[model samples]
Target chain A: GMSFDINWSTLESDNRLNDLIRKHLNSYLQNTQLPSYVSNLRVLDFDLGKVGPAITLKEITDPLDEFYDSIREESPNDIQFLLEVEYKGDLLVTIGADLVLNYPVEKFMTLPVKLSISDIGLHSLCIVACLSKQLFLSFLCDVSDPALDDNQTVLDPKGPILAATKPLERISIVRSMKIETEIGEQYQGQGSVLRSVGELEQFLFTIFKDFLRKELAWPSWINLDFN
Target chain B: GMSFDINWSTLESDNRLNDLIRKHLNSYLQNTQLPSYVSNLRVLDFDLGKVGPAITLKEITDPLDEFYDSIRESPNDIQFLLEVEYKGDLLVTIGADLVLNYPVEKFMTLPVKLSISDIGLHSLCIVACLSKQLFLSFLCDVSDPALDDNQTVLDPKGPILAATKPLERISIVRSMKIETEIGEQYQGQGSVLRSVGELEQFLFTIFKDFLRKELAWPSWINL
Candidate 1:
């Protein structure tokens, strides 16, 4: 039981909603989860840099006059919008982790890693949207240095080994790397076979913040059907 | 003195060189090399499907008049062309791969795989070019099922567990999957935990055909 027209000239594409939320946040960080001997998780450089991500609406309630109807009955063009998303960008990403070993028997070695993710932030994130066409989303957040571990070791064996001498040195003999920052630090890397590069980059940002707080939390709501 | 100017209509788009060789063949299959526990490798669906990849440029040989000057002295418009890249579509890709385990208690499990690549073919694969533009591409030959292993295992556990009843059962109890076709031997799937899904899909197509025959081979000249 919903119609249309809340068109403020297509809401002036607020930077096209920051380039459509940077393509669903780059497919939610390319479908999260890593650090299990990390194998070929390539993203080889992505940039949402040069600043972008500051959408602030802040008002528009009518979920039965902000829940006076006690709940579930607001189909009369239900609408709710109180969003404020800030992002101090410089979000550089350069990933290409490939360290797969199986020990002295099942055979294979090539600890090729080139991970580098720079400082990321999004201080005042408070989003909420529930429009006519089955679209509801929520997230009241704060992420300043969330897993902000600057990684390095621009691994150079050079393009598949000088394009091909193919000697198969298969580089690996326990070289090491480690780093920990954000007002509590530790760093090392003079020999490496991936000694938990900053604890696997904070275990891949804690499984990408527990999958974006269990699918965009905040009183639990996230459904987008548009059909 | 190697120079320029052989710009025939800026070499007419030709479907923009088939969309720039589908973006360097999708970053050469996203920097090849997989299958050692396949973790978070995602290329969730890529399509070069609806036909495109047929460039034919039959004549253009002036490499010192087709090699008269023997070899290594053909700057005067040094050209060499006999390219023919034919590709009969239906080249789909789905990849998801997330199987990481170190057995029992050092802890961890979740075989969340999705892998689906269908019927890829690029028949008349002959290719050659040596433009003054510091560009030289070579790959003359055939590829009809060169690892045309049509994989399938649409594994379903449903979007990170129904988006949040969040019960970490961590599914893994030796559920197997195997499929072997294209004129060859095997098929099984009834209790999967990835029993060498068709020998790891031909061990990821033999390391993607040894990295495309060591960076595009042909004439013992894969440079």
Candidate 2:
């Protein structure tokens, strides 16, 4: 760990970083691949609230390669630092998807479904900073799915969630889940199409978790182009 | 005059050039300097319609400079050809002027308006170099009195007022080439307003003249 003290006050207070995070998160979602059964993927609503992600300095380790070694490099300023990170934030994302149906014909109906994630907590997360100009985030822990309100349970046939959700109410949720999830696997296993209660939540969580790894894991970085 | 047969097929048919012309005209208006009495200057609307400018090659003349001389230059391909250009079919509308923020403290604005419904530019020669520099060397003229129709002035309290006086003629001459470096206003040629006892001519001259010079060749505006 570097012995120098960092200015935690300004770093913790700025919401600009939160804005950058929100923008990139949606950008990631926009390019996300969906199954044949799903179409018109869109972010309905989201808010990082007024605060940025609260990050703490866990430990600072050397770069994985000597190419980033300070002494060997002509410019010492280009050295890379891998910082173990712990971050918790108040952020919510509501995504909308239209489930395409081809029951009677090739294209017949579309059912709109909403997935909302209100809880954001990450563990075993590490951020690689190339002198702070660019950053790469990698985490090994499971990111939990959207919280289901007590009154909106899928198990209860009379629940508000199922009441508003037609056709979905008549169909068996477990059967629908199995079919949708299996169909999702056919589309490169991205898990973009899924329906029902706990199954949808777990499927979405895994999808998002895989998305983060593919986009921001080691060797790939988020460049902060200030201009 | 060089007896080269120019394939008019693509030149006459493509609407891409029309789009380019529209884009450049708007870009020119964005940087046009307005009078102190005017606050927000904007293009209300414009359309090249579906067709592009109809241009005809009158004559291709030798370059005005020996620097563009084909014989003296090692590469004959780099020679400049000053082609007399006649272009028509572009329409534009512009509106602005806070009116000195007067009688109501400039906070409230009643915009003065003008439109060029049809125009034929008979007097410009666009110089083309096969390689490096492209020059536009002609005095472009909106020589017709009929060119300046559809002028409207909006009063603060009225629906819309007609422009009683319009310009008799408008002329702009440019002898410059495009530069990649920093742009300097060519010969204090940002925007000009000249009026003598006529309200319509005063507004129209500034707007029209600014538009011409800004769109003229040898510009810092690449696009």
lDDT for each candidate structure:
0.39, 0.40
Calculate DockQ per candidate and list them: 0.01, 0.01
Tens-place lDDT per residue, model 2, A13-83, is 23455455656666776777866566665656556543333333433443344234422454223333323
Off by over 4 Å in 1: A1-55, A58-61, A64-79, A87-120, A123-137, A140-190, A193-195, A213-227, B1-223
Give me the candidate number with maximum lDDT.
2
Candidate 2's DockQ is: 0.01
Candidate 2 regions off by >4 Å? A1-30, A49-56, A61-74, A77-82, A101-108, A130-203, A225-227, B1-223
> How accurate locally is residue B85 in candidate 2, as Cα lDDT from 0 to 100?
32
Candidate 2: chain B TM-score equals 0.46
Per-residue lDDT over A1-227 for candidate 1, one digit per residue giving the tens place of the 0 to 100 score = 01111112223343554455445555665676555566555444455454444555544454423232324554443555545555444555555556555555652564565666555544433445444344565554332322112421111123232122222231211112232222112223422344545555666555444544555544344664332
* TM-score list, all predictions: 0.18, 0.30
Clashes of 1: 12
